[PDB]
Design a protein around this ligand. Structure first.
Ligand SMILES: [Mg+2]
Lengths: 62, 391, 36, 233, 563, 73, 216
């Protein structure tokens, strides 16, 4: 409902959302942009953003 | 992959970075003093500035941002003045021309931001149109004309190879390209003269390679005889070794074909360096190309009067047909429109015939550098029909 | 990725995180001002 | 009047006969004032000797082909023009190349008369087929730069060739922006020089510098007034 | 009506030429166009920026300040010259007399030139030596190349006068005071302030300098702990003010032309609660520079790409270096060859000509030419629109150009001429169209448009950076820009741009602190604009709530100081 | 087969991406490594001869080019 | 065959110089190098600052003078003067009208010579009084006004652009001759009365020799 409210016809969208007690999962990238969270795309994907990186033993040696 | 930032701009953007490096060195006592120093523009900052900016990317954006290439990353270098220097090849992507537009600069701060700028949005990494796959960072007008002049074959030019029937052998044989360069330094060889040279450092066409070598029996040392112009040699030198010798006058379309081939078969860094070398060469030879405008270079078709008189006779026939009560008013307008569209196309044809093909106004259009022939036709010849307030 | 194919910009196979939707919207809108 | 701060000349060696020189940093604008001059001096103001003409046995009128050998006349002219010869006899000198039987000819097979030298003896000239002989006369003489085919005459059997006198083969230059204190537009000159094995790039640069200095001392002779002074040479 | 060869220009570029004439900036010295219409004179006169003799008489006195004419009936009339007046847009209105003592002037005669006038004619630009040829890409895609002469000789230099203003008024905690005594400022920094705290006339002010010192009553709760202890131990007074002095804004400098001041003490009328009010008028001489926008009368605009040294500018046979290089690729598609005809006629006027009359008047010059059969160098000619110079006549004049000092004809009958590459020395292989073109300095200058910001004031409502250079604002990263950023997949760049550079009120101070101390950039927080959106929704009676994975609504809302 | 790149374009992007599956993975890779290095300077590395004043991110990219680091998506 | 350089005079301030012989395709480069050095690096003299008692800044007038201070400084740009001091010297100019203040009315200190006393500077009427003080220095090329905070200058000085170069206009041609070919370079120098074409070309050659001495 956040996405819809920000796209067009804010008034009607918000009224229907209030009536239907809607809940936004905060999963669309526009939603995350609105709330200041890493968008779920490109470098925002889970596999990418939580990568762990430690130097190998052979390199840690020298 | 570079762009020019006015000194003051960079000093303001990296202000905290420069304050940090001013406290690292002992130019500033404390951090407040580093701030005051950077604000007064004390001469110590400038050196330090060029250190902080090292390999620190920045984003350039021009509105309206229609596609992502409307925001591209660049490595910044300090420039004299209060203006941003923009690489010409990227103009296509930004729809940016230098008639006064401006652009915005953003400095990525976090490490992930700098990484996204270096890897994702680096100009060199975005040579191709994300919508069509075609190349955008490609020679556009001047470059084009430059190359188009450098790779043209001029029958009868100075130093042209002439296999002589007399006791004199043919005179257009040059051991290496450097010998041709020497010959052209003196007024002995034109860069556009059809000659024959022994090339030792350029791959030949597939067919000549198949005959004079194995299918791939070519190695950098292997030389071979080519029959081209010195210009086409200097051009094929700009493309990488591995690319076969082309030997065509480099219309924009052919440059696009070459860049497409390179992007499809080669890494992208090589393609970017190739387009940059093409840029440099095209600018130099565009300067040297002798394209100008002049009231005399705008030739007017010599048959224009008679063409117009003939179509006016047709139009008077149609108008008398209307006065006769035989034509519809909309039909009269329709007939007049057909007549005048034909007359315009005829004067355009006569113009294109009369114009020598080396005329600059023709060279600029035909080479694909910039503009269409409708403009050539409205400039000399006739504009033709013009629309209505209704349409 | 495979149903989508090559990434028109990178020339390689589209990466697993692309926002092909926005890129499509842009590729379709950018030439809009040429429609007469 | 003022003075210039720290102009230096550095060398990078790409090959044992090809090098890039860097003059940096020059005051804004002088890169172009002394770039084209140095290029033309290197390519046109160095004494060097090379082949001026040749007489081939077996073909004097047609010049079509040579019996007993694969290469045609023009390929031989090209192979010879790429010869490296250094001669001290300033008047014209003659040399002779002789070989026979199936095999292959080179630069060492030719007999260099006393005073002249051949620097690339391992070079190729032609390949003799079975029962193939080859006798040729070559003319060498000092000169400078590149002079086109000088013509022929009344003695049939000799064809003039293009004389690549210049000991330097290829020269190019560019001008990049270097930053003197507070100025990002000072000029730095870069010179790429690929030369023959007669002399190294450094020696050619030195000779060009001396010749130029003489030329411009011609103008310095008119009077001795102040001028841009430099610290290090 | 002031566009020469209008009929030769398409309506788009002609509309642009009119609009851009209306943007020329007055230059220190004005030079009428070598080739114009007939409208420059009448336009300048009716405009009302030149002084005109209301009554025919004799100049009785002339000064840089006024002009007195003694009419024939004994009357005296005097005219005061506007000297270095600031205009509504910063241009410099400055009149200069063009009469000499004892001159007899008729009614309506022009007495003094205005800002953009020359001997009574509209002079919006200068006559430049132009060469039409692509030059090393530095005039690529509409850029323009200028000879450094135009800097050394101030040919495109203009004067720009800004008016800084500041008032001392009544606040909650008291009343501001305009004082030279400002908290902990170096005696050397105030070195240019008078006893009042106002900068001294003729002082050269760089950006950041003080212009008028002013202190504003500060509350006691705002005093830092450091300041609290400082005022306690040393027994400081109870002034507790803040430095609200008027400083010169970024990218600005110049000599202080003038100072005006209005005091409530004196019988000076000011608004409520406004004690004092001072205005510093600062002038600056702007030399043409990279980025500045030039244009001809034919809608042919462009920014200056590079200003070359005079030595590497292409030059004619006699060493005369061109002044401006206009890229060829720009002319034909814009349908404004008017500029080319103007270049040809301008060279004709710059060299003068003599049509050969012996044996009759040639057919090409038969129709129009009456006193145009000959003309001295630097002749002033007008080609009205829809009348005037015909193509045949242009070519004819181009044939009989007069030669230079040495009797050399430099521009041939096509309007072209050989040129040397001032860089290598070798001549350019083909003749280039050289001529004289009228170029105006349009009021779009880098000095006005350059702007950067690392950190500055924010809006009290959205808590985002203020907008506008005047307010030291930040650039707007618009919706389409966020689209672009997403298309790249630059998640972290987009987050950073939208949280720690705009709205994270603690995140941004953290980021600055981390950059200053060489530490990694912290993780971003919550945009204040989101909290504000929530508050607005609530005020709309909508119960919005943020929730945890499995939880109730999350809520939104010392040790470092003691250390 | 290419001329010596300048600054940012070094190391070449193709050879760097051959070390990873996609561009974004490389992005996060290098950013993590650079943060780790900068922590070290106040934690392991650098793993190659650091430049005169090389940016930590540049050092991390070089380390990526030399395979001196391993990762796991 | 060694090359020779023969001068020719056309006026007191314009000389040609014929250099020959030169290798073909080589005179253009020499002529252009000399032209660049002449246009850029010929040491000369010019004004650095001026001071006018009644005036504190440029943008103002002086009572009784027809030219405002801006126009005065513009007219003064046209001054051609030569100083052997090589250190900041000062000239003075007083004048009460009526009358035309020209360059001659300047009292140059011994060692500085003003070369065009006819040049107009200002016009003065009954109530006009002019009193000027002009610092003259020795430099080369072009140096824009030196700021009043970049120097210890007080609010009085009115820094001015310094056009040091005494060379006016330089050009060249070459005659090419084709089996024994050669180029003859005809250089053409015109200078202000400050110094002679001969001296200008001499200093240019001196600087060019010093710079090409980097061959080592
Ligand atoms: Mg634009």
């Amino acid at each position: 409902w956040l996405s819809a409210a920000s796209f067009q016809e804010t008034t009607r969208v918000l009224t229907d959302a209030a009536i239907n007690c809607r809940s936004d999962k905060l999963n669309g990238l526009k939603e995350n942009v609105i709330i200041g969270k890493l968008i779920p795309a490109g470098t925002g994907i889970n596999r990418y953003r939580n990568i762990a990186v430690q130097p190998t033993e052979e390199a840690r040696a020298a | 992959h570079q762009c020019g930032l006015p000194k003051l701009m960079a000093l303001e953007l990296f202000k905290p970075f420069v304050m940090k490096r001013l406290v690292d060195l002992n130019h500033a006592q404390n951090i407040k003093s580093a701030k005051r120093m950077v604000e007064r523009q004390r001469p110590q900052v400038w050196d330090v500035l060029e250190e902080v900016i090292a390999e620190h990317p920045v984003l350039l954006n021009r509105a309206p941002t229609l596609h992502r290439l409307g925001i591209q990353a660049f490595e910044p270098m300090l420039v004299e003045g209060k203006a941003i220097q923009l690489h010409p090849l990227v103009c296509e992507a930004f729809n940016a021309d230098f008639d006064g537009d401006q652009m915005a600069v953003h400095l990525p701060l976090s490490a992930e931001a700098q990484a996204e700028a270096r890897i994702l949005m680096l100009s060199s990494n975005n040579i191709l149109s994300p919508a069509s796959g075609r190349p955008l960072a490609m020679p556009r007008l001047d470059m084009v004309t430059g190359l188009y002049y450098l790779t043209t074959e001029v029958p009868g030019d100075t130093g042209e190879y002439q296999p002589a029937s007399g006791d004199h052998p043919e005179t257009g044989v040059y051991s290496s390209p450097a010998e041709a360069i020497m010959a052209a330094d003196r007024g002995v060889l034109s860069v556009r003269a059809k000659i024959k040279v022994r090339l030792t450092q350029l791959r030949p066409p597939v067919e000549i390679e198949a005959e004079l070598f194995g299918h791939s029996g070519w190695q950098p040392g292997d030389a071979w005889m080519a029959e081209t112009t010195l210009g086409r040699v200097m051009f094929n030198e700009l493309l990488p070794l591995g690319y076969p010798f082309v030997n065509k006058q480099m219309h924009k379309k052919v440059q696009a074909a070459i860049i497409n081939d390179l992007a499809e078969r080669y890494p992208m860094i090589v393609v970017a360096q190739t387009v940059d070398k093409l840029k440099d060469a095209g600018f130099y030879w565009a300067t040297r190309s002798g394209v100008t405008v002049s009231m005399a270079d705008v030739l007017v078709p010599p048959r224009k009067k008679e063409i117009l008189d003939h179509y006016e006779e047709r139009a008077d026939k149609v108008e008398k047909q209307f006065q006769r009560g035989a034509l519809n008013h909309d039909e009269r307008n329709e007939a007049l429109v057909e007549i005048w569209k034909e007359a315009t196309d005829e004067v355009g044809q006569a113009l294109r015939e009369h114009y020598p093909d080396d005329n600059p106004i023709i060279t600029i259009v035909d080479s694909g550098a910039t503009g269409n022939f409708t403009q050539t036709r409205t400039l000399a010849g006739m504009k033709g029909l013009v629309t209505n307030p209704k349409g | 990725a495979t149903c989508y194919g090559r990434s028109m910009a990178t020339g390689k196979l589209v990466d697993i995180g692309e926002a092909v939707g926005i890129v499509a919207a842009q590729s379709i809108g950018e030439p809009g001002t040429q429609l007469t | 009047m003022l003075i210039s701060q720290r102009p230096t000349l550095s060398e990078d060696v790409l090959t044992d006969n090809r090098s890039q020189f860097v003059i940096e940093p020059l005051e804004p604008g002088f890169g172009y004032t002394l770039g084209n001059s140095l290029r033309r001096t290197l390519l046109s103001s160095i004494p060097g000797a090379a082949v001026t003409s040749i007489r081939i046995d077996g073909v004097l009128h047609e010049f079509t082909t040579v019996p007993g050998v694969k290469e045609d006349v023009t390929e031989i002219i090209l192979n010879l023009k790429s010869l490296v010869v250094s001669s001290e006899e300033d008047e014209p000198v003659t040399m002779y190349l002789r070989k026979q039987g199936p095999g292959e000819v080179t630069a060492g097979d030719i007999v260099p008369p006393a005073g002249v030298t051949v620097h690339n003896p391992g070079m190729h000239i032609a390949t003799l087929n079975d029962k193939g002989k080859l006798e040729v006369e070559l003319v060498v003489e000092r000169g400078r730069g590149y002079v086109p085919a000088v013509q022929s005459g009344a003695e049939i059997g000799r064809i003039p060739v293009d004389s690549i006198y210049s000991p330097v083969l290829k020269v190019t230059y560019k001008v990049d922006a270097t930053r003197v204190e507070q100025r990002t537009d000072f000029d730095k000159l870069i010179l790429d020089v690929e030369t023959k094995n007669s002399i190294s790039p450094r020696d050619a640069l030195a000779s060009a510098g001396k010749t130029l200095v003489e030329l411009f001392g011609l103008a310095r002779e008119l009077n001795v007034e102040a001028e841009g002074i430099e610290i290090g040479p | 009506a002031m566009i020469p060869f209008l009929e030769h220009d398409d309506a788009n570029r002609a509309l642009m030429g009119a609009n851009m004439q209306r943007q020329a900036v007055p230059l220190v010295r004005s030079e009428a166009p070598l080739v114009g219409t007939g409208m420059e004179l009448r336009a300048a006169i009716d405009a009302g920026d030149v002084v005109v003799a209301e009554e025919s008489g004799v100049i009785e006195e002339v000064s840089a300040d006024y002009i007195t004419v003694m009419h024939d009936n004994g009357t005296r009339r005097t005219y005061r010259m506007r000297k270095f007046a600031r205009s509504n847009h910063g241009t410099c209105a400055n009149q200069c007399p063009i009469v000499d003592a004892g001159d007899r002037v008729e009614a309506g005669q022009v007495i003094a030139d205005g800002p953009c006038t020359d001997d009574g004619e509209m002079a919006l630009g200068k006559n430049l030596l132009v060469a039409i040829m692509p030059w090393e890409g530095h005039n690529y895609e509409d850029a323009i190349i200028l000879s450094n002469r135009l800097v050394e000789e101030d040919v495109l230099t203009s004067i720009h006068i800004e008016e800084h203003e500041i008032d001392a008024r009544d606040t909650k905690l008291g009343a501001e005071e305009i004082t030279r005594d400002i908290p902990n400022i170096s005696d050397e920094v105030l070195a240019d302030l008078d006893e009042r705290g106002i900068v001294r006339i003729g002082a050269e002010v760089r950006d950041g300098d003080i212009l008028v010192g002013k202190v504003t009553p500060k509350g006691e709760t705002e005093l830092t702990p450091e300041e609290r202890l400082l005022r306690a131990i040393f027994g400081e007074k109870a002034r507790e003010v803040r430095d609200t002095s008027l400083k010169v804004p970024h990218g600005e400098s110049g000599k202080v032309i003038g100072i005006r001041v209005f005091s409530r003490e004196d019988e000076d009328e000011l608004p409520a609660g406004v004690n004092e009010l001072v205005r510093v008028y600062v002038a600056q001489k702007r030399k043409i520079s990279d980025g500045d926008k030039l244009a001809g009368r034919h809608g042919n605009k462009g920014v200056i790409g590079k200003i070359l040294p005079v030595e590497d500018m292409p030059f004619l046979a006699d060493g005369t270096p061109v002044d401006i290089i206009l890229n060829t690729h720009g002319v034909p598609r814009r349908m404004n060859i008017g500029q080319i005809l103007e270049t040809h006629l301008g060279w004709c006027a710059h060299s003068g000509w003599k049509v050969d009359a012996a044996k009759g008047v040639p057919d090409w010059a038969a129709r129009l030419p009456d006193e145009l059969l000959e003309a001295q160098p630097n002749a002033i000619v007008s080609t009205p629109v829809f009348d005037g110079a015909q193509e045949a006549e242009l070519q004819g004049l181009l044939s009989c150009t007069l030669p230079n000092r040495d009797g050399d004809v430099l521009v041939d009958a096509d309007g072209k001429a050989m040129l040397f590459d001032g860089r290598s020395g070798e001549p350019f292989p083909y003749p280039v169209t050289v001529g004289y073109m009228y170029i105006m300095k349009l009021h779009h200058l880098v000095d006005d448009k350059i702007h950067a910001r690392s950190t500055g004031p924010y809006s009290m409502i959205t808590q985002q950076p203020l907008g506008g250079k005047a307010q030291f604002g930040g650039q707007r990263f618009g919706e389409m820009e966020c689209w672009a950023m997403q298309a790249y997949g630059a998640a972290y760049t987009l987050q950073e741009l939208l949280t720690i550079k705009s709205d994270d009120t603690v995140g941004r101070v953290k980021v600055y602190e981390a950059i200053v101390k060489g530490e990694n950039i912290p993780e971003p927080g919550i945009p204040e604009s989101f909290k504000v959106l929530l508050k607005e929704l609530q005020s709309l009676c909508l119960n919005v709530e943020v929730l945890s994975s499995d939880g109730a609504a999350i809520e939104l809302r010392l040790e470092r100081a003691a250390a | 087969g290419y001329d010596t790149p300048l600054g940012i374009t070094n190391p070449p992007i193709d050879e760097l991406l051959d070390r990873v599956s996609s561009k974004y993975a490389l992005v996060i890779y290098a950013a993590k490594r650079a943060r780790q290095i900068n922590d070290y300077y106040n934690y392991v590395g650098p793993l190659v001869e650091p430049g005169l004043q090389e940016k930590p991110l540049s050092i991390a990219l070089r380390e990526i080019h030399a395979d001196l680091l391993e990762h796991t998506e």
